[PDB]
Design an enzyme around this catalytic site. Structure first.
Site, PDB file in Angstrom:
ATOM      1  N   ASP B 156      31.898 102.492 -51.239  1.00  0.00           N
ATOM      2  CA  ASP B 156      33.154 101.755 -51.328  1.00  0.00           C
ATOM      3  C   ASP B 156      33.178 100.792 -52.496  1.00  0.00           C
ATOM      4  OD1 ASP B 156      35.707 100.874 -50.532  1.00  0.00           O
ATOM      5  OD2 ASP B 156      34.800  99.216 -49.356  1.00  0.00           O
ATOM      6  N   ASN B 395      21.687 101.231 -47.667  1.00  0.00           N
ATOM      7  CA  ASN B 395      22.868 100.692 -47.006  1.00  0.00           C
ATOM      8  C   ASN B 395      23.588 101.823 -46.289  1.00  0.00           C
ATOM      9  OD1 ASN B 395      26.217 100.233 -47.599  1.00  0.00           O
ATOM     10  ND2 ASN B 395      25.135  98.630 -46.410  1.00  0.00           N
ATOM     11  N   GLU B 396      23.716 101.667 -44.995  1.00  0.00           N
ATOM     12  CA  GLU B 396      24.480 102.561 -44.139  1.00  0.00           C
ATOM     13  C   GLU B 396      24.202 104.043 -44.332  1.00  0.00           C
ATOM     14  OE1 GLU B 396      28.515 101.245 -44.708  1.00  0.00           O
ATOM     15  OE2 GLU B 396      28.119 100.138 -42.798  1.00  0.00           O
ATOM     16  N   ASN B 450      26.018  96.074 -39.803  1.00  0.00           N
ATOM     17  CA  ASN B 450      27.320  95.949 -40.463  1.00  0.00           C
ATOM     18  C   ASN B 450      28.336  96.290 -39.388  1.00  0.00           C
ATOM     19  OD1 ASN B 450      25.932  95.543 -42.856  1.00  0.00           O
ATOM     20  ND2 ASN B 450      26.661  97.437 -43.844  1.00  0.00           N
ATOM     21  N   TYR B 452      32.306  95.567 -37.610  1.00  0.00           N
ATOM     22  CA  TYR B 452      33.675  95.235 -37.995  1.00  0.00           C
ATOM     23  C   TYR B 452      34.562  95.166 -36.763  1.00  0.00           C
ATOM     24  CZ  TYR B 452      32.446  95.619 -42.904  1.00  0.00           C
ATOM     25  OH  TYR B 452      31.850  95.424 -44.136  1.00  0.00           O
ATOM     26  N   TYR B 456      38.172  97.381 -38.395  1.00  0.00           N
ATOM     27  CA  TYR B 456      38.082  98.828 -38.070  1.00  0.00           C
ATOM     28  C   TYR B 456      38.039  99.004 -36.552  1.00  0.00           C
ATOM     29  CZ  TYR B 456      36.815  99.238 -43.044  1.00  0.00           C
ATOM     30  OH  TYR B 456      36.807  99.176 -44.406  1.00  0.00           O
ATOM     31  N   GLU B 487      27.018  92.476 -42.786  1.00  0.00           N
ATOM     32  CA  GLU B 487      28.419  92.558 -43.160  1.00  0.00           C
ATOM     33  C   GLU B 487      29.305  92.363 -41.946  1.00  0.00           C
ATOM     34  OE1 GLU B 487      29.609  96.009 -45.310  1.00  0.00           O
ATOM     35  OE2 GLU B 487      27.762  95.946 -46.560  1.00  0.00           O
ATOM     36  N   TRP B 532      30.924  89.836 -45.411  1.00  0.00           N
ATOM     37  CA  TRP B 532      31.308  90.789 -46.473  1.00  0.00           C
ATOM     38  C   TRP B 532      32.781  90.531 -46.745  1.00  0.00           C
ATOM     39  CZ3 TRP B 532      28.553  93.929 -49.547  1.00  0.00           C
ATOM     40  CH2 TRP B 532      29.237  94.888 -50.291  1.00  0.00           C
ATOM     41  N   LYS B 551      38.142  91.965 -48.932  1.00  0.00           N
ATOM     42  CA  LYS B 551      37.409  91.300 -47.861  1.00  0.00           C
ATOM     43  C   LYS B 551      36.662  90.045 -48.326  1.00  0.00           C
ATOM     44  CE  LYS B 551      36.561  95.146 -44.693  1.00  0.00           C
ATOM     45  NZ  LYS B 551      36.926  96.197 -45.666  1.00  0.00           N
TER      46      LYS B 551
HETATM   47  C1  LIG Z   1      35.464 101.135 -34.769  1.00  0.00           C
HETATM   48  N1  LIG Z   1      35.476 102.468 -35.354  1.00  0.00           N
HETATM   49  C2  LIG Z   1      35.586 102.576 -36.774  1.00  0.00           C
HETATM   50  N2  LIG Z   1      34.512 102.317 -37.505  1.00  0.00           N
HETATM   51  C3  LIG Z   1      34.588 102.407 -38.831  1.00  0.00           C
HETATM   52  S1  LIG Z   1      33.417 102.151 -40.061  1.00  0.00           S
HETATM   53  C4  LIG Z   1      34.361 102.483 -41.451  1.00  0.00           C
HETATM   54  C5  LIG Z   1      34.158 102.512 -42.875  1.00  0.00           C
HETATM   55  N3  LIG Z   1      32.825 102.157 -43.397  1.00  0.00           N
HETATM   56  C6  LIG Z   1      32.315 100.946 -42.778  1.00  0.00           C
HETATM   57  C7  LIG Z   1      31.250 100.198 -43.509  1.00  0.00           C
HETATM   58  N4  LIG Z   1      31.490 100.045 -44.832  1.00  0.00           N
HETATM   59  C8  LIG Z   1      30.671  99.107 -45.269  1.00  0.00           C
HETATM   60  O1  LIG Z   1      31.557  97.881 -45.163  1.00  0.00           O
HETATM   61  C9  LIG Z   1      32.419  97.589 -46.278  1.00  0.00           C
HETATM   62  C10 LIG Z   1      33.810  97.992 -45.997  1.00  0.00           C
HETATM   63  O2  LIG Z   1      34.061  98.934 -45.207  1.00  0.00           O
HETATM   64  O3  LIG Z   1      34.753  97.372 -46.597  1.00  0.00           O
HETATM   65  C11 LIG Z   1      32.050  98.344 -47.562  1.00  0.00           C
HETATM   66  O4  LIG Z   1      32.606  97.641 -48.657  1.00  0.00           O
HETATM   67  C12 LIG Z   1      30.588  98.382 -47.693  1.00  0.00           C
HETATM   68  O5  LIG Z   1      30.275  98.931 -48.998  1.00  0.00           O
HETATM   69  C13 LIG Z   1      30.012  99.232 -46.660  1.00  0.00           C
HETATM   70  O6  LIG Z   1      28.645  98.787 -46.499  1.00  0.00           O
HETATM   71  C14 LIG Z   1      31.584 101.266 -45.460  1.00  0.00           C
HETATM   72  C15 LIG Z   1      32.614 102.195 -44.840  1.00  0.00           C
HETATM   73  N5  LIG Z   1      35.174 102.824 -43.705  1.00  0.00           N
HETATM   74  N6  LIG Z   1      36.365 103.117 -43.183  1.00  0.00           N
HETATM   75  N7  LIG Z   1      36.627 103.122 -41.891  1.00  0.00           N
HETATM   76  C16 LIG Z   1      35.658 102.810 -40.978  1.00  0.00           C
HETATM   77  C17 LIG Z   1      35.767 102.764 -39.506  1.00  0.00           C
HETATM   78  C18 LIG Z   1      36.957 103.051 -38.746  1.00  0.00           C
HETATM   79  C19 LIG Z   1      36.854 102.949 -37.384  1.00  0.00           C
HETATM   80  C20 LIG Z   1      38.042 103.229 -36.450  1.00  0.00           C
HETATM   81  C21 LIG Z   1      39.124 104.031 -37.169  1.00  0.00           C
HETATM   82  C22 LIG Z   1      39.467 103.425 -38.490  1.00  0.00           C
HETATM   83  C23 LIG Z   1      38.293 103.451 -39.442  1.00  0.00           C
HETATM   84  C1  LIG Z   2      29.883 106.307 -44.431  1.00  0.00           C
HETATM   85  N1  LIG Z   2      30.599 105.157 -43.924  1.00  0.00           N
HETATM   86  C2  LIG Z   2      31.593 105.348 -42.894  1.00  0.00           C
HETATM   87  N2  LIG Z   2      31.272 105.149 -41.626  1.00  0.00           N
HETATM   88  C3  LIG Z   2      32.149 105.316 -40.642  1.00  0.00           C
HETATM   89  S1  LIG Z   2      32.070 105.152 -38.930  1.00  0.00           S
HETATM   90  C4  LIG Z   2      33.656 105.568 -38.491  1.00  0.00           C
HETATM   91  C5  LIG Z   2      34.413 105.681 -37.291  1.00  0.00           C
HETATM   92  N3  LIG Z   2      33.803 105.392 -36.019  1.00  0.00           N
HETATM   93  C6  LIG Z   2      32.514 104.662 -35.931  1.00  0.00           C
HETATM   94  C7  LIG Z   2      32.253 104.132 -34.632  1.00  0.00           C
HETATM   95  N4  LIG Z   2      32.142 105.242 -33.711  1.00  0.00           N
HETATM   96  C8  LIG Z   2      33.368 105.893 -33.552  1.00  0.00           C
HETATM   97  C9  LIG Z   2      33.884 106.421 -34.871  1.00  0.00           C
HETATM   98  N5  LIG Z   2      35.682 106.051 -37.361  1.00  0.00           N
HETATM   99  N6  LIG Z   2      36.248 106.312 -38.527  1.00  0.00           N
HETATM  100  N7  LIG Z   2      35.605 106.225 -39.664  1.00  0.00           N
HETATM  101  C10 LIG Z   2      34.315 105.860 -39.698  1.00  0.00           C
HETATM  102  C11 LIG Z   2      33.455 105.712 -40.885  1.00  0.00           C
HETATM  103  C12 LIG Z   2      33.860 105.942 -42.235  1.00  0.00           C
HETATM  104  C13 LIG Z   2      32.925 105.760 -43.210  1.00  0.00           C
HETATM  105  C14 LIG Z   2      33.265 105.982 -44.671  1.00  0.00           C
HETATM  106  C15 LIG Z   2      34.384 106.977 -44.817  1.00  0.00           C
HETATM  107  C16 LIG Z   2      35.610 106.514 -44.047  1.00  0.00           C
HETATM  108  C17 LIG Z   2      35.314 106.385 -42.542  1.00  0.00           C
END
Ligand SMILES: CNc1nc2sc3c(N4CCN([C@@H]5O[C@H](C(=O)O)[C@@H](O)[C@H](O)[C@H]5O)CC4)nnnc3c2c2c1CCCC2
Ligand SMILES: CNc1nc2sc3c(N4CCNCC4)nnnc3c2c2c1CCCC2
Ligand SMILES: CNc1nc2sc3c(N4CCN([C@@H]5O[C@H](C(=O)O)[C@@H](O)[C@H](O)[C@H]5O)CC4)nnnc3c2c2c1CCCC2
Ligand SMILES: CNc1nc2sc3c(N4CCNCC4)nnnc3c2c2c1CCCC2
Lengths: 580, 580
Positions: B156, B395-396, B450, B452, B456, B487, B532, B551
């Site tokens: 990201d 990271n992740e 990390n 959220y 998220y 984060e 973060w 953020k």
């Molecule tokens: C509770 N369920 C979910 N869990 C997650 S997790 C996730 C996701 N990653 C998280 C973690 N970051 C990390 O945090 C920072 C950031 O995200 O800004 C990054 O800058 C940083 O580089 C990186 O270390 C990288 C990317 N990206 N998009 N959607 C999600 C998502 C979603 C859901 C529910 C549906 C909607 C989307």
């Molecule tokens: C590799 N980094 C990520 N990690 C994660 S985790 C999660 C999620 N969850 C997590 C919790 N369990 C239920 C499903 N839903 N949507 N997107 C994500 C998600 C994404 C990314 C990056 C691409 C965009 C979405």
């Protein structure tokens, strides 16, 4: 039938607007008889206005269920003589009127007027008026509440509720005017076109005579007949950005009501949308009855401000987006010469985004009956508006699904038959449909697309997006019908700027519209460009909404984004007529 | 081994930074021998700096492939005496050095230093230096290029490339110092703790003696031995926000190099992260080498500004997020007493978001070999930094997938064995893992999450989000290890405000962190809060990125959002030590 309450020698009008008592239902509300006694530990709440944003905390903003408006009423006995009526111009969702403790009226539909008579429960002294309002939305409401205790709109605006428009008390003679209708035939043949108007008055509860005046009050013709006619040579034709409104005084049985009316012709012909037998081109946008902190509440000043900005910007039209607007705004477009696309509450009739299909008859939507009552109530209300040139049955239904055609045809038919002016009918097509797949290709006189090439499709690649938009629009031309875009735009945060644009920047927004506008200009069957949206507005929260919908050309407080100056320059070089 | 080039009586240092010639490869670049002749129709381009934002249009910003930096070089013959070396501190992605037309060096890895000697191709007169840089990212690069002609980051942040850090020319005696190593043992027992440091010098190409000075240049001890020792009673222990740095002069064979060093102990014990045998609590954030218009380019002023803001805010630590930072920043944290979590380029080792699995060995990632060379090169570079208290392998990653454990253990092992100080090892866990499912529960000394909850997960419902975060964090405690959040945050557009908050508003951001901070404070095994991000930074475009990542607690130009004043007040009431 619903005439706009006005002040006439025969009828009086008293507004009930002001600060009413107000309480959020706690579940036990109806059990106990709140509509009987005066609300206790009440709160204050202006009417007319949406109540969501008028208090603090999520508890008002996100309330599920009922609220209770309550105000005291008192008429002078010397009025019982005449008929007493309560007109609620709009209670968002479900309304339930109680007087002195008894239910008197009930309504479904948050954006159209409904009345109830008071002569025989209007007590003497001070009466306890109670209006209970429900905000719940589901597969049986238009607009459509989705499944995702909370309302989840299946539509992209916030679920503002309360007494959205005003509540007044007017009176009438016992036998009264109830619905005037007027149509026109124009003989453009003569170098000085003239016209014959057909009256059709209706009474309930005797002699009735019709007077016809001009702009300044000069009488010009008279006649008698609850279904007579009238003649006007050298007629002043209402025209876009050049309104001419005659007036009409219907005196009938100690009751007289006046009506403005503009003479113009609407007619589709091939790939041409014709107003007064000329090839029009829509310029404008889709709007929303959305202001702060009024919610969807009525806003006469912003109405005039919005129309001032449109003339400043060199626009000519707007679409009552996702619901009919106030009667005041409709009359204003008549005065000001704004072409309006009048649209129903039918948004969210689409479950696409085991899987249920939209028009499944056990598990899908249950809206067609109400959809019909809306089409009738709406056309009954706005039939005489010269500004209305077209009807929109629904915004973005799953119109390319099975069940689709069967759902809409009965509604198109009902619409085409109830418009005394037989005006063009349409529905606004979502992204995904094509000429071949869209039940609108057959049922609609005008193809109205909502496309987002440059945002949802293809953004940030405006080249790839242009290729897509040419490809799709090209195909739409094979129908040999007029096609206008009723939405296109890009979310833009006022203030974010860059020399090499990125999405959400005012510069990216201007570039988006340059690409789309370039392609539009290649096809002589494109008869309209209406951007989404006129101004930033409130939506439900979600990761894709930057404190609401930011696709406006203007901010929520009407200040222009850079793109507003791009359109003003472009629209200034494009005529209402003859652009093709 | 890579010592930080400095100015010593034995070695000289000449910076090559400035405006270099520069050309975007057109495909035919290598075919024709651009690295042979002077670039023609060249462009200007400062070095050191990322080149993406330094010109206009998408053609620079979004270039796929190679670029050619080119500059002239000329050394005084009177220098051939000594060894001549070219140190490239960081060329983002792949580097290829040509001198006079011949390849001299090649490197993979955009964020760590690499050198090459010049004595035997350094011509006399003016030499044509050429550095060709490639920006392509894939399953064989760290960071990891995804599948979605364009780079698509599986991470990201924006894919800034070019000569990210400086290029200098230093010299040396023929037999020279090549790698000094120092470790420390402290006997906190005594009421006046003292310490014994172990030297370990290395030469290549004779007598070598070690001098030990204090902060002000006062000598205090001497010895001889390429592997000797040293004693310091009443030792000034380096401490968070209270740096004490001794200095060290290694004179050896006409070559002398000086090194600062701080004496401190890092040790995990149960649910306590101990620095100098005391229970530390991380306060701070994850950062990014991101400024405008430098890109990821080095920025000494903002480095000092960032550290000034951290002290103003009452923070104590930061994580080299998604890549090692410059050597200058690392030394600065030594001087200023900033606890640093040093992290590798290993982000995007996760394909989760027929389906390929992350650690499939034919179709998944191909990064482990390079991942190892990074762990070694990084620890070789920063081993002597008192600010570094922990290592972050990745990271992740998809750390709860099959193949996961097998991938990382060889890397944890290599890390635990190559750190002369045997410092804690970790990896930062993505949302979704749990104590039971996370291969980090076993391999890591500190659990770094990390999460959220509030964005998220669950946003905008902070109640539901709190319930989730308590539930998950509660479980993480069963491991009996220290857990810190590396984060948590919420996208916030500086300037968007509301009394009843909505997402993206500065008020929603403050509330988010109040909820998370309340729950953190319930568990004595939470030893760290790092938000973060420190400041808004550039990302690839997408519907979910409002002109980048918003953020930050601060804007991209370091101005505070409301939340920056919330943390400053909270962190001011929380000690570096003994918070639990
Ligand atoms: C509770 N369920 C979910 N869990 C997650 S997790 C996730 C996701 N990653 C998280 C973690 N970051 C990390 O945090 C920072 C950031 O995200 O800004 C990054 O800058 C940083 O580089 C990186 O270390 C990288 C990317 N990206 N998009 N959607 C999600 C998502 C979603 C859901 C529910 C549906 C909607 C989307
Ligand atoms: C590799 N980094 C990520 N990690 C994660 S985790 C999660 C999620 N969850 C997590 C919790 N369990 C239920 C499903 N839903 N949507 N997107 C994500 C998600 C994404 C990314 C990056 C691409 C965009 C979405
Ligand atoms: C090219 N393929 C796609 N096509 C589409 S279509 C779509 C979508 N609708 C469009 C249409 N609007 C209409 O336009 C306005 C708006 O959206 O702002 C509304 O205010 C207005 O009330 C409403 O009439 C209602 C909702 N909402 N979200 N994503 C999409 C989406 C996406 C993609 C690709 C993947 C990403 C999402
Ligand atoms: C009912 N209004 C919508 N209509 C549409 S259409 C489309 C799409 N496309 C369309 C083009 N064909 C390929 C797939 N992709 N993602 N979301 C959508 C989408 C959405 C909504 C509202 C809910 C959010 C997404």
């Amino acid at each position: 039938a619903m005439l706009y309450p006005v002040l006439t020698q025969s009828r009086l009008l008293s507004d009930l607007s002001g600060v009413w008592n107000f309480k959020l239902d706690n579940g036990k509300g109806f059990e106990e008889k709140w509509y009987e006694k005066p609300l206790k530990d009440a709160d204050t709440m202006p009417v007319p206005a949406s109540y969501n944003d008028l208090k603090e905390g999520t508890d008002f903003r996100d309330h599920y269920g009922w609220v209770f408006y309550q105000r005291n009423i008192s008429v002078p006995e010397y009025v019982k003589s005449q008929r007493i009526v309560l007109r609620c111009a709009a209670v968002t969702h479900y309304a339930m009127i109680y007087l002195n403790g008894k239910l008197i009226c009930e309504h479904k539909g948050g954006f159209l007027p409904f009345e109830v008579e008071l002569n025989d429960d209007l007590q003497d002294g001070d009466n306890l008026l109670t209006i209970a309002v429900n905000n719940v939305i589901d597969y049986t409401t238009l607009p459509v509440g989705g499944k995702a205790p909370q309302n989840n709109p299946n539509f992209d605006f916030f679920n503002y509720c309360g007494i959205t428009r005003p509540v007044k008390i007017y009176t009438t003679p016992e036998t009264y005017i109830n619905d005037i209708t007027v149509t026109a035939d124009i003989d453009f043949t003569k170098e000085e076109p003239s016209a014959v108007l057909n009256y059709n008055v209706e009474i309930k509860g005797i002699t009735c005579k019709v007077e016809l005046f001009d702009e300044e009050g000069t009488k010009l013709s008279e006649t008698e007949g609850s279904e007579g006619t009238f003649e006007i040579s050298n007629v002043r034709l209402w025209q876009p950005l050049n309104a001419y409104l005659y007036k009409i005084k219907v005196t009938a049985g100690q009751d007289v009501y006046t009506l403005p009316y503009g003479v113009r012709s609407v007619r589709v012909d091939g790939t041409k949308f014709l107003i007064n037998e000329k090839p029009f081109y829509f310029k404008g946008y889709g709007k929303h009855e959305d202001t702060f902190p009024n919610g969807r509440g009525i806003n006469l000043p912003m109405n005039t401000k919005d129309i001032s900005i449109m003339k400043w910007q060199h626009a000519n039209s707007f679409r009552t987006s996702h619901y009919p607007y106030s009667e005041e705004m409709m009359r204003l477009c008549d005065e000001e010469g704004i072409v309006v696309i009048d649209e129903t509450t039918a948004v969210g009739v689409n479950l696409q985004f085991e899987r249920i299909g939209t028009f499944d008859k056990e598990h899908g939507v249950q809206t067609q009956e109400h959809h019909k009552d809306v089409i009738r109530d709406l056309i009954s209300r706005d039939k005489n508006h010269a500004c209305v040139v077209m009807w929109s049955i629904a915004n973005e239904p799953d119109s390319a699904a099975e069940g689709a055609y069967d759902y809409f045809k009965p509604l198109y038919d009902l619409a085409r038959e109830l418009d005394p002016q037989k005006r063009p009918c349409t529905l606004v097509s979502v992204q995904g449909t094509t000429a071949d797949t869209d039940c609108s290709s057959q049922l609609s006189d005008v193809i109205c697309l909502n496309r987002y090439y440059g945002w949802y499709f293809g953004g940030p690649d405006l080249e790839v997006s242009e290729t897509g938009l040419r490809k799709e629009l090209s195909d739409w031309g094979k129908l040999g019908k007029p096609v206008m875009f009723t939405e296109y735009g890009a979310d833009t945060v006022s203030g974010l700027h860059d020399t090499t644009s990125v999405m959400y920047t005012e510069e990216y927004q201007v570039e988006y519209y340059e690409m789309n506008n370039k392609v539009f200009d290649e096809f002589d069957f494109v008869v309209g460009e209406q951007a989404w949206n006129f101004a930033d507005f409130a939506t439900s929260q979600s990761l894709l909404r930057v404190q609401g919908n930011k696709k406006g050309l203007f901010t929520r407080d009407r200040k222009p984004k850079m793109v507003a100056h791009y359109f003003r320059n472009r629209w200034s070089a494009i005529p209402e007529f003859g652009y093709k």
